[PDB]
Design an enzyme around this catalytic site. Structure first.
Site, mmCIF file in Angstrom:
data_model
loop_
_atom_site.group_PDB
_atom_site.id
_atom_site.type_symbol
_atom_site.label_atom_id
_atom_site.label_comp_id
_atom_site.label_asym_id
_atom_site.label_seq_id
_atom_site.Cartn_x
_atom_site.Cartn_y
_atom_site.Cartn_z
ATOM 1 N N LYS A 1 13.172 -15.533 1.325
ATOM 2 C CA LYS A 1 12.925 -16.270 2.553
ATOM 3 C C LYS A 1 13.809 -15.717 3.669
ATOM 4 O O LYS A 1 14.990 -15.431 3.441
ATOM 5 C CB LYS A 1 13.202 -17.759 2.349
ATOM 6 C CG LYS A 1 12.352 -18.404 1.270
ATOM 7 C CD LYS A 1 12.704 -19.871 1.100
ATOM 8 C CE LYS A 1 12.501 -20.637 2.397
ATOM 9 N NZ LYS A 1 11.097 -20.544 2.881
ATOM 10 N N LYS B 1 6.985 -5.020 2.227
ATOM 11 C CA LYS B 1 5.714 -4.753 2.877
ATOM 12 C C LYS B 1 5.303 -5.964 3.700
ATOM 13 O O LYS B 1 5.682 -7.102 3.410
ATOM 14 C CB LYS B 1 4.608 -4.404 1.871
ATOM 15 C CG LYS B 1 3.384 -3.780 2.526
ATOM 16 C CD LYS B 1 2.366 -3.290 1.521
ATOM 17 C CE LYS B 1 1.179 -2.666 2.238
ATOM 18 N NZ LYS B 1 1.581 -1.465 3.024
ATOM 19 N N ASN B 2 4.527 -5.695 4.739
ATOM 20 C CA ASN B 2 3.993 -6.707 5.633
ATOM 21 C C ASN B 2 2.557 -7.040 5.249
ATOM 22 O O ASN B 2 1.960 -6.412 4.370
ATOM 23 C CB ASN B 2 4.086 -6.235 7.091
ATOM 24 C CG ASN B 2 3.243 -4.995 7.371
ATOM 25 O OD1 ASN B 2 2.482 -4.530 6.523
ATOM 26 N ND2 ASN B 2 3.386 -4.451 8.575
ATOM 27 N N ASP B 3 2.013 -8.056 5.916
ATOM 28 C CA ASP B 3 0.624 -8.441 5.706
ATOM 29 C C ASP B 3 -0.299 -7.269 6.016
ATOM 30 O O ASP B 3 -0.125 -6.573 7.019
ATOM 31 C CB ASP B 3 0.277 -9.642 6.587
ATOM 32 C CG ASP B 3 -0.867 -10.462 6.027
ATOM 33 O OD1 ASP B 3 -1.325 -10.157 4.906
ATOM 34 O OD2 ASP B 3 -1.311 -11.409 6.709
ATOM 35 N N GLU B 4 -1.285 -7.057 5.146
ATOM 36 C CA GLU B 4 -2.130 -5.870 5.210
ATOM 37 C C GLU B 4 -3.132 -5.830 6.371
ATOM 38 O O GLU B 4 -3.364 -4.740 6.910
ATOM 39 C CB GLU B 4 -2.868 -5.684 3.877
ATOM 40 C CG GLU B 4 -3.995 -6.662 3.589
ATOM 41 C CD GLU B 4 -3.511 -7.950 2.950
ATOM 42 O OE1 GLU B 4 -2.296 -8.230 3.004
ATOM 43 O OE2 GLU B 4 -4.353 -8.683 2.392
ATOM 44 N N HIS C 1 -0.928 -5.058 0.387
ATOM 45 C CA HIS C 1 -0.017 -6.193 0.304
ATOM 46 C C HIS C 1 -0.604 -7.257 -0.614
ATOM 47 O O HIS C 1 -1.821 -7.463 -0.646
ATOM 48 C CB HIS C 1 0.245 -6.762 1.698
ATOM 49 C CG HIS C 1 1.371 -7.746 1.749
ATOM 50 N ND1 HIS C 1 2.682 -7.365 1.940
ATOM 51 C CD2 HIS C 1 1.384 -9.096 1.642
ATOM 52 C CE1 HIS C 1 3.454 -8.437 1.943
ATOM 53 N NE2 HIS C 1 2.692 -9.500 1.765
ATOM 54 N N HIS D 1 -9.533 -6.900 -6.174
ATOM 55 C CA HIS D 1 -10.142 -8.209 -5.939
ATOM 56 C C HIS D 1 -11.210 -8.480 -7.001
ATOM 57 O O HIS D 1 -12.417 -8.424 -6.759
ATOM 58 C CB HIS D 1 -10.720 -8.272 -4.530
ATOM 59 C CG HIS D 1 -9.690 -8.467 -3.458
ATOM 60 N ND1 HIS D 1 -10.003 -8.450 -2.115
ATOM 61 C CD2 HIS D 1 -8.354 -8.671 -3.530
ATOM 62 C CE1 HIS D 1 -8.905 -8.642 -1.406
ATOM 63 N NE2 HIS D 1 -7.890 -8.779 -2.240
ATOM 64 N N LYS E 1 -15.090 -27.225 -11.606
ATOM 65 C CA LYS E 1 -16.490 -27.647 -11.460
ATOM 66 C C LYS E 1 -16.852 -28.485 -12.686
ATOM 67 O O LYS E 1 -16.070 -29.372 -13.062
ATOM 68 C CB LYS E 1 -17.355 -26.416 -11.220
ATOM 69 C CG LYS E 1 -16.912 -25.561 -10.042
ATOM 70 C CD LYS E 1 -16.894 -26.350 -8.746
ATOM 71 C CE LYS E 1 -16.360 -25.503 -7.601
ATOM 72 N NZ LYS E 1 -14.959 -25.062 -7.841
#
Lengths: 459, 524, 524, 92
Positions: free
Chosen positions: A165, A190-193, A286, A320, A328
C-alpha cells in the site's frame, strides 16, 4: 468432394501421441443441449473462417482437407479431438513453408459469435516432446531468461511484482521509493495495463513515453531499473540505425524495462527479426482478471485457449481463461464435480498416470479461495503454473514481518529448491484466509468468508 | 483535480435537498399505515424491505453535493444498523428535526460548538433519565409481547420464540432457514452437535436411515492416521467387555483400519462409529477440550505432553447417547463434572473479551451454547424469499429486543419517556446563551419520534403531540387503535439500549455536521 | 445508469401498463379460441407457443419500472415451472386481478396489513373449501379425460398416454424422446437398462448382432477390476462344469480379459458375458447394491475382506433374463425372494424420505421405478422440431396433471369449482372494515379469472356469471362445446392443488405489491 | 519460550539490546560461540517478569548503567538517521 473419408483415427489419445507429428487446431463440436444440430454445423466453419471468394488452393495443389477433417472419437462423452492439419501441408526442401494463402484459409478457427460459451473448461491436450523436428520450439520464460542469476524453469522464480500500500499512483521513485527500496518483495512494480499511446487514451498519453527521460537513476544511484516505465513506443522505425551491434545496453529484460501487452494491438509481433535470437518478449500484462467477461453482468471477450497453444513463447503471467463456474443453479449432477473428480474416497485407478509424453507446468489458477489449511484440495495434479502465489493483501499490512514470504521474485527460488512436494506452491504462507476482508468478488456463495457482510444476524 | 467549494447556506440547500430526499424515502416506511420499499437488483429480483440503511446505501442522486452528502450521512445509518436495525427510524427522524428546527431558526450566526456542547450535555442528562426510568421486565408473557412489538405486531412467531426461550433458557441459540416448510415450526436439539456424518455407509445400524444410535458410547480422539495404533485391543477389549459401543474422532484413517472396522462391525459384537474431523484445525483443537470436559475425559492427542501411544480405560470420556446420520452427528449427554465444566466456562469468560469481531467470537459463542444447552431448529413461515427475509429480520430484531429488555428493563413505547423527561429537565443551564439555545433546540427536537408517528398515521402531529404531553405516566395514545391507552396495558414497551445507542450516535453526527462552513465537490 | 426515484402513483401508474402488456401477451392465449404468440431467438428459429409461462420466461421491455413489475410477476410463473407447469394462464389472470384490486385499494386507501390479512384468510378458506370439494379419481377413463383436456381435448394422444399409464402402472415413469416418424409409438423398458455393450465383435451370442440373451443368468460381482491375476477360474471353471451362463461385473476389461472371453465364446468353453463400470461412485454403488439385493447376490468388494481367489460358489446372482446389445445391456427381471425385495424397497423408500428432495431423489426414483414400475417411452411422430416442441409441451402438461391427480385427485376444472368455492367464501368476515373490504375485493379478484375466460371466447359475461353463480353442482359452461351442461359430462377435471399453489403464490405476490410506496431505478 | 519473527538485522539489534538491558549476553552465532562454549551465568536474568497470552513483559533489568549508557552513547548517532520518517520514531 464431401469432407471426410481421409482420416479414420479410431483410437484414443494414445494413437495421437504415437504419431508425434499431430497438431490439433479446431473447435469442439459439442452441440449444446438446447441448441439443435443444424446451428452447430451452420456456424462452425461456413461463415466465420475465411470469407472464401469462390475457393483457394496451395501451390502444392490438391489439398483434401479444407473442411474439418474430423477424427473426433465419440463413444462415451463425445470427447472432441479435431485437428486442422499443418504437417500434411506444403513441405519444401529447405524451409518447408507454404504460400501466402495456405494458412490464411483453414487454420484460424474463429469462435466469433456462436453460443458455445456458457461453461467449457478445457484441461489438457498439448503438443508432445516431439516438437523440435521441423519447428522452432519455445520453452523459456523470465524464469529461464535470467536463469543464471537464480531462476529455474517451473515455478522457480519470476519477475512479476507485488505492491505494498498504496496500490498504485504517486510513483514510488520520488517519495514512495521505500516501498521499492525493500528487496524483500518490492522488486518489480507494474502499473495498470490499459494505458499507452492508444487512440482512446487520456491526457496521460504524453506522460508514458516521457518516463524514458528519467532513467538517470540506474547507474550512479546504486539501484537497477526494475519498474514497468511504460515507454515502449508504437512506431518502431528509429532504433534501426545505431543500436544493432554493440549499444544493446538496454538488455533482453523485456519484463524489467516495460513492455506493453494489452492483448489487442501488440500480441507477439516480434517474431520477424528474432526467430531464434530473442524469441522472448515477456507477456507483460498487469495482473487484472475476473472482471471483464467472466462476470455474467459484463461479458466482453471470447474463448481462444485452444488456439493459444503456440503462444508459450511469450512467457505468460496472465491469460483470460474464464472461471471455475460456481454459482447460479446447482444440482442435476451439481457443478461441484471439481472436487468429486479426485477428492472422492471410493475411487481407484491402478495402472496409468498423467503422462502425455511431454509434461510441463500445468495447474489451474486459484480462484475463490484455496488455503494451505485445505491441504486435501488443489495440490493433486501439479499445483503450480508459471506464476507465484500472490493474492489480495488482507493480512499483508506490515513492513517486513515474515520477510521470506513476501519475496515475490526470490522466495520462489527457495520454495522450489526446497523440494518438498506440491506444497511448494503454498509452502510460502497460509494466513491468506484473512485476505477475503479486502477482495469480496472471489468467494461469494459457498465459502463462509462473506457471511459477515450481509445475510441477517448470523455468523 | 476538479474541485468546487460552496460556503454556508449556498452549500447547505443542496445538502438539505439530499437529506430531505432521504427523509422522503424513510418516513413513509414506518407506522401501521406505512409501506416497505423495493430494492432494485440487476442480477435478481428487487427485494421489498423496511431496511432503511440498505436503502441509504443504494440511494443515489445525480447532483454531486447531494449524492456525497447522502453517502456521508449514510455512516450514522450504518452505525445504527450495527446494533438493532429498528429505532434507526427514531434516529433519522430526530436528525430531520434537528436540521429543520435548527437551520430554520438559528440561521447560522450562532456558534455551532456551543450548540453542540449544549446538546451533548442534554443527551447526557437524557441518558441519565432513561437509565433512572427504565422498568425491569420479568414475565415471559411480556417478553412475547415486546417481541411481537418488535415483530411488527405479529404474535404467532413471537409466542413461538417465547416458548423457545422457555425451553432453552438464556443460553439457547436459534437457526436461520431458507425455504424449508413455508409455515412456522420450532424444535430443539439438545446436547452437543457435530457437523459430520459417518464416512462409510457400511455402518448401517439399528435405527432407520442407516443411522447410528448408541447408548453409553466411549470416545476416542485422534489427530493422526491410525495404522499401528491399531494396537488399542486392550482398550477395544475393555469396551467390548463393557457392553457399550465406542466412537472414533480419528483425523485420518488407514486403509487397513477402515477395512478392519468394516469386517469386524459387520459380524461381531463391537459396532463402532467413525467420523472425520468436524472442521478447521484451530476450532477443532479448541473444541477438543470441550469434548473432554463434556464427557469428563482428557483430550487424546499426540501433540500434548501426556503420552503419544499409551491409553487406559479412564483416558476416554463417557457419554450417554449418540445419534449420527450420514451428514450430522449429535451426542445427547456426557459423563462430566460440573466443576471442570464451569472452570472451562470461566476461562471462556475471559475468552469472550476480543476484538476480532467475526471468526473466533462466533464459533466460541456457538460451542459455548452447545456446552450449556442445545440449538433451536426452525422452519420459517413465509411464501416468498422476500417474505422469509423480512420475517427473519423481525425475528432477530425481537431477539435483540428481548436481550436488551432482560438485561436493562423496558420503558413506554413511542419515545414518550424521552419527551417527558425532556419536559422534566427543561431548566437545563449552559455556559453561555448559545449553549442554552442548543439545549432548547435539542429538547424541542426530541419530540420528533412521536411527531413522525402521528404524521404517518394520517393524523395531525401537533394536536396528538399536545394531547400526549397532557397525558402522563404509562398513559398516552395508542396509535394502533388510533385512540388513547396505557402503554403497559397495550403492552407496547421498548428496551432502552437501542434508544440510547441511536440517540448517542445521532447526536454525535448532528453535532459534527452542523459545524460545516464549506463543502467540496468534484466537477465532471 | 444513474438512479431515478418515483413516488406513489408515479410508480403505480407505470406498474399498470407493465402487467397490462403482460396481460396483452398472455390472457388472450388460453382456450380453443385462444391463440399462440411468437418468441424468437436470434441464433435459433422462432417458437410459437400457447404456454403462458413460456411467454413469461423471456419477458422484458425497455421501461425499467415495467420490467421490474414484470420480473415480480414472473416469479409465480417460475414457481409454476418448478411445481406445477400448467395453470400458468391462471396465475397470469390472477396477477391481473390483483393489480386491478390493488389500484382500487390505493384509490380507497385500505391498510395493506389488513389487506394482506384478508387476502391470506380468504386464500386459506378457499383451500379448505376446495379440500371439501375434492373428488377421488381412480378409473382410467377419467385419466384419459384429464390427459385430453390437458392436451386441449386431444383424444388420440390422451388415450395413448392413458393406455401407457395403465400398462406401466403408477410406478412407471415416462421419458421424452426425439421424433423420427409421422406417428407416435410406445415402448416399455423393463429391468435395469444401461449403456453397456460388447467391446469386441466376437461376443456375439445366439441372437446375432453381438446380442447376448440369457435366461436365468448367473451373475458374478467382480469388484473394481481384474487384469493381472486374471484367474476368476475357481468359480469360472466350476460353473463351466455346471454348464450355466456367466455374468461378470467389473469396472475395467483389459486385453487379457477380452482374450479369454473370446476364448470362451469361440472355443465353446461356457457362455460368459461381462459388464463395465457404470459411472460415478454414488450411482455405481447404488445400482450394484440394489441389483445384488434384488437378485440375491453377494456383496463382493476387495475394499472388504474378499478376493476373486477367496470366493464362494454362492456369490452368484440370479435374474430372469438379460439382453445385451451393441451399446445397451438390460436386465429384464431378477430372481429374489419377496420379503427381501419388499424390505429393500422399504429401505429405498427410507431413502425417498430424504432431506435433499431434489434431483438426487429423482435419480433415486429411477431406481424405485425399476424396483416396481418400468421405463415408458413415447417416441413422437413429429415432422418438424417446433411441432415436436409443442407436442412435448402438451404431453408434459398432461404428465403434470396426471401425476398431481395421483396424489391429490381431481376437481371440476375451468374455474367452475373455483367460482363455486369463491361464492361459498362470500360469507367470510374480517376483523375490521379493512379486512371485510379486502375479503370482498378478493371475491371479485377470484371472479376475474372466470370472466376473462368468458371474454376469451367473446361470450356473454353477465349471463354466464349470473347463471353459474346462481347455479350449483355439475352445471357449468364448456369452452370446447361452448355450452352449459353437467360437469362430469364436460369432464374438465383438474387436480386442484396446482391451482391451490398458484393462488397462494398469487396471494403472496399481491401482499408484496400492495406495499407500493416508492421506487428507485437505473437510467437507460 | 519466545520466538522472534522479525527482520534479521533489526531482530538481532533488539535481541542484543534486550541482553544489555537484562545484564545478559546473547548466545548468538554472530560470535563463534555456541552452547558447548556457554555457561548458566551467560544467561539473562531479571528480578520480576510477567507473561500473558499475547504479550511478554520484563520489569527489571541487570545491565544497570554500564550497558545502558554505553548503548546510549553508541545510539546517539543512530538517533539521527537517513531513513527519516518514523524510523527514528521506532528507534526512540
Amino acid at each position: 468432394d464431401q469432407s471426410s473419408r481421409y482420416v479414420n483415427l479410431a483410437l484414443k489419445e494414445e494413437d495421437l501421441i504415437a504419431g508425434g507429428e499431430h497438431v490439433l487446431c479446431a473447435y469442439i463440436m459439442k452441440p449444446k443441449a438446447g441448441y439443435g444440430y443444424v446451428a452447430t454445423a451452420a456456424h462452425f466453419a461456413a461463415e466465420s473462417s475465411t470469407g472464401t471468394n469462390v475457393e483457394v488452393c496451395t501451390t502444392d495443389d490438391f489439398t483434401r482437407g479444407v473442411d474439418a477433417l474430423v477424427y473426433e472419437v465419440d463413444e462415451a462423452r463425445e470427447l472432441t479431438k479435431i485437428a486442422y492439419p499443418v504437417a500434411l501441408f506444403d513441405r519444401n526442401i529447405t524451409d518447408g513453408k507454404a504460400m501466402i494463402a495456405s494458412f490464411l484459409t483453414l487454420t484460424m478457427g474463429n469462435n466469433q459469435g456462436m453460443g458455445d460459451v456458457e461453461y467449457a473448461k478445457m484441461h489438457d491436450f498439448y503438443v508432445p516432446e516431439a516438437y523440435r523436428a521441423l519447428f522452432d520450439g519455445p520453452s523459456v520464460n523470465i524464469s529461464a531468461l535470467w536463469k543464471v542469476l537464480g531462476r529455474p524453469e517451473v515455478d522457480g522464480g519470476l519477475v512479476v511484482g507485488t505492491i505494498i500500500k498504496p496500490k498504485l499512483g504517486l510513483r514510488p521513485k520520488p517519495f514512495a521509493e521505500a516501498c521499492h527500496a525493500f528487496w524483500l518483495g518490492g522488486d518489480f512494480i507494474k502499473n495498470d495495463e490499459p494505458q499507452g499511446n492508444q487512440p482512446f487514451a487520456p491526457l496521460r498519453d504524453t506522460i508514458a513515453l516521457v518516463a524514458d527521460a528519467m532513467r538517470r537513476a540506474q547507474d550512479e544511484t546504486g539501484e537497477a531499473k526494475l519498474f514497468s516505465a511504460n515507454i515502449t513506443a508504437d512506431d518502431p522505425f528509429e532504433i534501426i540505425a545505431r543500436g544493432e551491434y554493440v549499444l544493446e545496453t538496454f538488455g533482453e529484460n523485456a519484463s524489467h524495462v516495460a513492455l506493453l501487452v494489452d492483448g489487442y494491438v501488440a500480441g507477439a509481433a516480434a517474431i520477424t527479426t528474432a526467430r531464434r535470437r530473442f524469441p522472448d518478449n515477456f507477456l507483460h500484462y498487469h495482473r487484472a482478471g475476473h472482471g471483464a467477461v467472466t462476470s455474467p453482468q459484463s461479458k466482453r471477450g471470447y474463448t481462444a485457449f485452444v488456439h493459444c497453444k503456440m503462444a508459450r513463447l511469450q512467457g505468460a503471467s496472465g491469460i483470460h481463461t474464464g472461471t471455475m463456474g460456481f454459482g447460479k443453479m446447482e444440482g442435476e449432477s451439481s457443478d461441484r464435480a471439481i472436487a468429486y473428480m479426485l477428492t472422492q474416497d471410493e475411487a481407484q485407478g491402478p495402472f496409468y498416470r498423467q503422462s502425455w509424453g511431454g509434461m510441463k507446468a500445468c495447474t489451474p489458477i486459484i480462484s475463490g479461495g484455496m488455503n494451505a489449511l485445505r491441504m486435501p484440495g488443489f495440490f493433486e495434479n501439479l499445483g503450480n503454473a508459471n506464476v507465484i502465489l500472490t493474492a489480495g493483501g488482507g493480512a499483508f499490512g506490515h513492513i517486513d514481518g515474515p520477510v521470506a514470504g513476501a519475496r515475490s521474485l526470490r522466495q520462489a527460488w527457495q520454495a522450489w529448491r526446497d523440494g518438498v512436494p506440491v506444497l511448494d506452491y503454498a509452502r510460502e504462507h497460509k494466513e491468506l484466509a484473512r485476505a477475503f476482508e479486502s477482495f469480496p468478488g472471489d468467494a461469494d456463495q459457498i465459502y463462509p468468508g462473506w457471511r459477515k457482510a450481509l445475510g441477517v444476524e448470523d455468523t | 483535480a476538479a474541485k468546487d467549494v460552496k460556503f454556508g447556506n449556498d452549500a447547505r440547500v443542496k445538502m438539505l435537498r439530499g437529506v430531505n430526499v432521504l427523509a422522503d424515502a424513510v418516513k413513509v416506511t414506518l407506522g401501521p399505515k406505512g409501506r416497505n420499499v423495493v430494492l432494485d437488483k440487476s442480477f435478481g429480483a428487487p427485494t421489498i424491505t423496511k431496511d432503511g440503511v440498505s436503502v441509504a446505501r443504494e440511494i443515489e442522486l445525480e447532483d454531486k453535493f447531494e449524492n456525497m452528502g447522502a453517502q456521508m450521512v449514510k455512516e450514522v445509518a450504518s452505525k445504527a444498523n450495527d446494533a438493532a436495525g429498528d429505532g434507526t427510524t427514531t434516529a433519522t427522524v430526530l436528525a430531520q428535526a434537528i436540521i429543520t428546527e435548527g437551520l430554520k431558526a438559528v440561521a447560522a450566526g450562532m456558534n455551532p460548538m456551543d450548540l453542540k456542547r449544549g446538546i451533548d450535555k442534554a443527551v447526557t442528562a437524557a441518558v441519565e433519565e432513561l437509565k433512572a426510568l427504565s422498568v425491569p421486565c420479568s414475565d415471559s408473557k411480556a417478553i412475547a409481547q415486546v417481541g411481537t412489538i418488535s415483530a411488527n405486531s405479529d404474535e404467532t412467531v413471537g409466542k413461538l420464540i417465547a416458548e423457545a426461550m422457555d425451553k432453552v433458557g438464556k443460553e439457547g441459540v436459534i437457526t436461520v432457514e431458507d425455504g424449508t416448510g413455508l409455515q412456522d415450526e420450532l424444535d430443539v436439539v439438545e446436547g452437543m452437535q457435530f457437523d459430520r456424518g459417518y464416512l462409510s455407509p457400511y455402518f448401517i445400524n439399528k435405527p432407520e436411515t442407516g443411522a447410528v444410535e448408541l447408548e453409553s458410547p466411549f470416545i476416542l480422539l485422534a489427530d493422526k492416521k491410525i495404522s499401528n495404533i491399531r494396537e488399542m485391543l486392550p482398550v477395544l477389549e475393555a469396551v467390548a467387555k463393557a457392553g457399550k459401543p465406542l466412537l472414533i474422532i480419528a483425523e485420518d484413517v488407514e486403509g487397513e483400519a477402515l477395512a478392519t472396522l468394516v469386517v469386524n462391525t459387520m459380524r461381531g459384537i463391537v459396532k463402532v462409529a467413525a467420523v472425520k474431523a468436524p472442521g478447521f484445525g484451530d476450532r477443532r483443537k479448541a473444541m477438543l477440550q470441550d469434548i473432554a470436559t463434556l464427557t469428563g475425559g482428557t483430550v487424546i492427542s499426540e501433540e500434548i505432553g501426556m503420552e503419544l501411544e499409551k491409553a487406559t480405560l479412564e483416558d476416554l470420556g463417557q457419554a450417554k447417547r449418540v445419534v449420527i446420520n450420514k451428514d450430522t452427528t449429535t451426542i445427547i449427554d456426557g459423563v462430566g463434572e460440573e466443576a471442570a465444566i464451569q472452570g472451562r466456562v470461566a476461562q471462556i469468560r475471559q475468552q469472550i473479551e476480543e476484538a476480532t469481531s467475526d471468526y473466533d467470537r462466533e464459533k466460541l459463542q456457538e460451542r459455548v451454547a452447545k456446552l450449556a444447552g442445545g440449538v433451536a431448529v426452525i422452519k420459517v413461515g413465509a411464501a416468498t424469499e422476500v417474505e422469509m427475509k423480512e420475517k427473519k429480520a423481525r425475528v432477530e430484531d425481537a431477539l435483540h429486543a428481548t436481550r436488551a429488555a432482560v438485561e436493562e428493563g423496558v420503558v413506554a413505547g413511542g419515545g414518550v419517556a424521552l419527551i417527558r423527561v425532556a419536559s422534566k429537565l427543561a431548566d437545563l443551564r449552559g455556559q453561555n446563551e448559545d449553549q442554552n439555545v442548543g439545549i432548547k433546540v435539542a429538547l424541542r427536537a426530541m419530540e420528533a419520534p412521536l411527531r413522525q408517528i402521528v404524521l404517518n398515521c394520517g393524523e395531525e402531529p401537533s394536536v396528538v403531540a399536545n394531547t400526549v404531553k397532557g397525558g402522563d405516566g404509562n398513559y398516552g395514545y395508542n396509535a394502533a387503535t388510533e385512540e388513547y391507552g396505557n402503554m403497559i396495558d397495550m403492552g407496547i414497551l421498548d428496551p432502552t439500549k437501542v434508544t440510547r445507542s441511536a440517540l448517542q450516535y445521532a447526536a454525535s453526527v448532528a453535532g459534527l455536521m452542523i459545524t460545516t462552513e464549506c463543502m467540496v465537490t468534484d466537477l465532471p
